[model samples]
Target chain A: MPLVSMKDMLNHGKENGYAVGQFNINNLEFGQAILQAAEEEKSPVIIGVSVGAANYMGGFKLIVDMVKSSMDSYNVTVPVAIHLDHGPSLEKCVQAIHAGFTSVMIDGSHLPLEENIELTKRVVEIAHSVGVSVEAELGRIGGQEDDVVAESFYAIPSECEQLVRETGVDCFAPALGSVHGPYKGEPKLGFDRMEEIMKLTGVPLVLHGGTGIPTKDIQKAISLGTAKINVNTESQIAATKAVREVLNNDAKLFDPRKFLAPAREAIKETIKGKMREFGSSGKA
Target chain B: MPLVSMKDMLNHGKENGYAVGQFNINNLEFGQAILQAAEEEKSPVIIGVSVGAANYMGGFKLIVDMVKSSMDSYNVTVPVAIHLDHGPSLEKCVQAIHAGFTSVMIDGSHLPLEENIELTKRVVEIAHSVGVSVEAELGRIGGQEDDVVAESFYAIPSECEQLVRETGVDCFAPALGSVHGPYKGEPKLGFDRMEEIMKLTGVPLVLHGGTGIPTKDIQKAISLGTAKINVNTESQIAATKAVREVLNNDAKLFDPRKFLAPAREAIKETIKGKMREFGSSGKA
Candidate 1:
């Protein structure tokens, strides 16, 4: 199937009491694994390309091409969205849109509400004009978001409503205590505020830093109108652990296929588990 | 710039007393590193994709997309040819050609000379019609050639000329004493046979199993009309070592970029040095 915007996917998830996965593609293996996972689960998938991942995989154009070609190669029948995960700038969002991204998350969470709204509105105008979905971030998710590390900050429900209203974004990531990277312990998420924000926004909400979230919490978030869950840290850890395992076990193994294939499978397992946890399996 | 066939790249290399490096891309990082190295070195490069690599990378279409997209993302100024390294069958070659590969090496080396010629001729007809280049392998190269391992065998001058004449192949690999994986001791190449085959065929030659060949041997092979040299084992070792190093040193590192970036650099360094050795630097 051809790539689609995330608007319908998120809306369907919100209405169906499920959440779609925004699995980040760090490289070719990550992409292949995610596509296979989505296909096997009969689920719609969002391939989240972060600013750093875009650069790492060459650029946004390359990321889109990789996703599209991987889809074609894998014979993907499910809807897939190529979305910029945490776009650091308006220019970056514009770049991703021009490069054929089906959706973009214009992350202005670091800025004041007025600036964030202004930036997101501009991106929404450009993205929506091209039939691309726009996702906006309101609060600072804890841990390292790409290169930027920050403390947790709950998105104000009023500010979230204002940003969502002003920007006209398809989805909103109101960081209510979820983090980006690894968790030292079980993390606390503000469910009351999350529900309130979802009620005020009247649009699908996003749960960022999905790694290490309990299954019950994931279900609860979905029930509270969280339509998208971003998961990268878990995939990264899975892939890295798989690579390390092969390299450590076979001292003479140098063929990349021998090791990277396992890493790709590991990532596939990680994504499959997330899809099941998000209640997105067979939701396509 | 758009991808070009290996025809001109090899012709230029043969005419200019240099050899363009055919770096096999194992994944996204390998493609990115090879493109960056070629651009930095001002060298024309052929991205050789084995069947295993094509499958590991999803398929031929994905491989083509990855290569093309990486080139665009890197703003690659030098020439590049996406060539199938050791295509197992005529169908594989056709698949690669349809998927936008600029060149393909149909390995009918395991079959009799007549079968090899017939296969090569068929591929040449289809590929040349589309302006794609065909590379035919005559003799077996040591180590694994995309899952088919064979002992080294010297190519007969008469057979080389006959195959080249019958198929009208763009380039020929005589496979004179080079192995694919690694070198256990000082390896000896059939230089006289290689020169004779080159002279008889009057076509550019390919030196497969180019991992551990000495600088002097490389210069000698290039002087004998070898225009395309395949180097994959060294790149794999370099990349694997870099990943192992990073993983060994940083127990907490999980993000693939933290380690894979180093692996990409390692592959880039290996390619750059090979370009310098092949006398392809500044020859774009």
Candidate 2:
């Protein structure tokens, strides 16, 4: 099937009171695992590639091509949109859009309010002109997936509103209580703050750092305002554990297939569980 | 010019006793910046793509295409090899080679000695068959790059010899005392350990963590045995500082070129400094 529109996916989640799962892909295995899980659950989903992951996988074009090719190769029935996750440069966000990403997040959250708005607005204008969905980040998400952990403060609600109006972004990712990666410890919720941002912005919010967050909290956040949930750490842990366990258990294992296959399975399971928790399973 | 043979590069650098420089690319600006530096310095350099950067830029195929295209587009005269840096999977390594990467490093340093050897050997066989250069890691380079940090133990000297003989990789990147990214304070050097590995292994060794090590230390490492010095943090710091400086100077700046141009210049200057320090300058 053809690529799913981001608008369709987001709205689909909204109507169902669940969030569309945005899974991160590193390579063929990661992409395949994410899609396999999505397909098995029959969910409309989004596959993400951040700048670092994009470079690792090869480049932006390859990410788009491979994901599309993988979908075709797998003859996937579930709807999945290729997304640019946490774009740091306008060049990259534009490149992803040009590479045929259905959705993109221009992460100008690091810049001053005016600068972020201006840059995001520029990207939004160009991207929207070409019918692409835009996601602009307001708050800084910490922990490292592929780069430095940001210690930047949560985005101001007023700034978030101005950015949306200025950039006309389709989705907003606010850093309210979000931490990328393993959460470090027990995850905390800033629900009251999140509610404030939600009421003020009135746009579909994106909850980044969804990895390792409790399911109950995730569902609660979704109920509050988040319509898209992005998880990477959980799958990374799952995949690494899977591969390492096999390596440790079987000293006799020599084949790449034997080692990597389990990792893929582990990732698929984790993704499926996330999808199920998001209330996204069988929602496509 | 087409990518120079890795065997040729390794041989040339070895004969000169000055290690080649491999800088990671994050954008078109970065590719051009590295190439410009190489061209200006009359250097033989390696332009690298971590799997993450490749996907962010476009794809492995696209990265290869872009690098080749950029060589012509920018009229670069440097003898630069498009190398895959730290490919985590066989599929990614193979895909990179197939996409026209001239050099690749199969990093199995995190695995056990035998397992690392087995994986490296497989990569060398396939990569060598295609006349592409294969680099194998003997042990883990702990610390972090961008956001991906590990704390694995350093490479064992005996393991380095065992893996090189078993794998027959064209280039070797051993952990030595070099970790990824900058040390929180002054990093320790295991020169005596590195010398031991170099004497035992007989292959060109790659020294990572080139970013923050003092210039004298870099010179010392090169003189000792390292044949390739991978620099990312230095270039990143240079570029970022340049960008920040530009931003600080002119709050009115909106054009990326205005800011990034200095970043590019900073990268060139940093590269030149490394080249001069390594005595690798004008070796090409």
Candidate 3:
């Protein structure tokens, strides 16, 4: 299948009790591993690209073509969405859409609520016109996501409701105390506020900073209407650990395929674990 | 700006007394690094894909699309060639050509002279029909290239002339003495034989096992009609060393980009260095 918007995939997850995994792709191997894992597990998957990652991988159009070509080469039949994660601006989101991304997250959480909604509304207008899905953020997601870092700020129930209703975003990532990168300790997510925001906005919720959140918390969030979970650090950790182990073991190994092949396997296994943990396996 | 056959690039190199560097791309970063280096240097480049590297990269079609999209996204204006390095069979060469590679090297040197010529002739017929250039090997280079390893077998000047006359190949890799992978000691290249073959065939000769050869030897090869030098191990070593240094220094660094960004820069620097050494830096 060709690329599709995340709208239907997340709605399906919302209707069902499972949450689809959005695994950020760093390069060709990462994309291959994630797609292979999803197909093998029969799970619908989201291939997320941060602005920094797009720059690293060449550009948004290159990332889109790589994912699509990999899907074709891997015979990936599971539903796959090419999404821009934590898109920094309206122009970034528009560039992603123009480059054939099926979905994009317009991250304007740093701005004032009125400004955030206005920017998101503009992105929604352009994205919806092209039948692509738009995800917008409210409240600050903590820790480092690419170059941006912030302390946790819980999304206010009223602000989330206003943002969702005003911007017409397809999904909401209302930061509720989850941290990007690796968490320092046990995360304290706002379950009560999560339920309130879900009830108020009446849209699917996105759980960012998915790496270190406890599986029970993940289930709790899913039960409270979180339909999409974004994961980056866990896979990076798994791949890095695998690479470190290999290089440490065989100091003479220079061929990247020797080490990176195992790294790709580690990433695939990590994503498959997430698929199972999220109850997304066999959902496709 | 699109993919071009190496026919003209190598021909121009022959006329200008320079050599184009064929850098093997292992993944997205490697491709990005090599292309950016070539563009910055204003040099024509060959992105070589061994069969093993191609499989590790998903497939040939995916590799083609990735390079083309990356070229567009990186705004690469210099000439680029997607080349199949050490293609194992006529069928593999045809597949690469069909998948949009601009050049291919059919490594039939293991076969007997008659069989190698027949196989190369078949590959040349199909590749030339589609405007793709064919490179064929005459003698076996030593050390490991991909999964295959061999002890060096020097090419006979008469055999090199016969193969070129029979197969109508674009360029010749008459294995004189270089070795793949890192060298155990100083390499013993057949300079006299190299000059003889170049004088006999009157065609642009390819110098394989480019990693450990000395700069003076490279210049000598270039002066003796070696117009294309294939490099892989040196760049891989440079990139791996950079990645290893970063990972060792930062024990907590889990992000692949943190290490790989440096790795990409190392690859670019290494390629740029080779381009200058090959005297192809400003030949584009």
lDDT of 1: 0.87
Name the regions of candidate 1 deviating beyond 4 angstroms.
A144-152, B144-152
Tell me how far the alpha carbon of residue B239 in candidate 2 is from the true structure, in angstroms, after superposition. Answer: 35
Judge candidate 3 against the unseen true structure and give its global Cα lDDT, from 0 to 1. 0.89
Q: How well does candidate 2 reproduce the true complex, by DockQ?
A: 0.02
Q: Give model 2 RMSD, 1 decimal.
A: 14.1
lDDT of 2 by residue, B180-243 (tens): 7657666666788788888988878888878777878887777777878888767776765665
Highest TM-score: which candidate? 3
Residue B279 in candidate 2 has what lDDT? Answer: 69
| DockQ, all models | 0.72, 0.02, 0.70
What ranges in model 3 sit over 4 Å off?
Answer: A144-152, B144-152
For candidate 3, give the lDDT of residue B76: 92
**B1-284 per-residue lDDT for model 1 (tens digits):** 89999999899889989999999988766888889999999998999898887766778887777777777767899998999988988899899899999999999999999999998899999999999999998887876443333344777789999999999999999988878776756676889998899889999999998888898899999999999999988999999999899999999998888988899889999999999999999998
* TM-score ranking from best candidate downward: 3, 1, 2
Residue B24 error, candidate 1, Å: 1.2
Q: At residue A47, what lDDT does model 2 achieve? A: 91
Q: Write the per-residue lDDT of candidate 1 for residues A162-217, one digit (tens) a residue.
A: 99988899999988888778665677788999999999999999999898888888
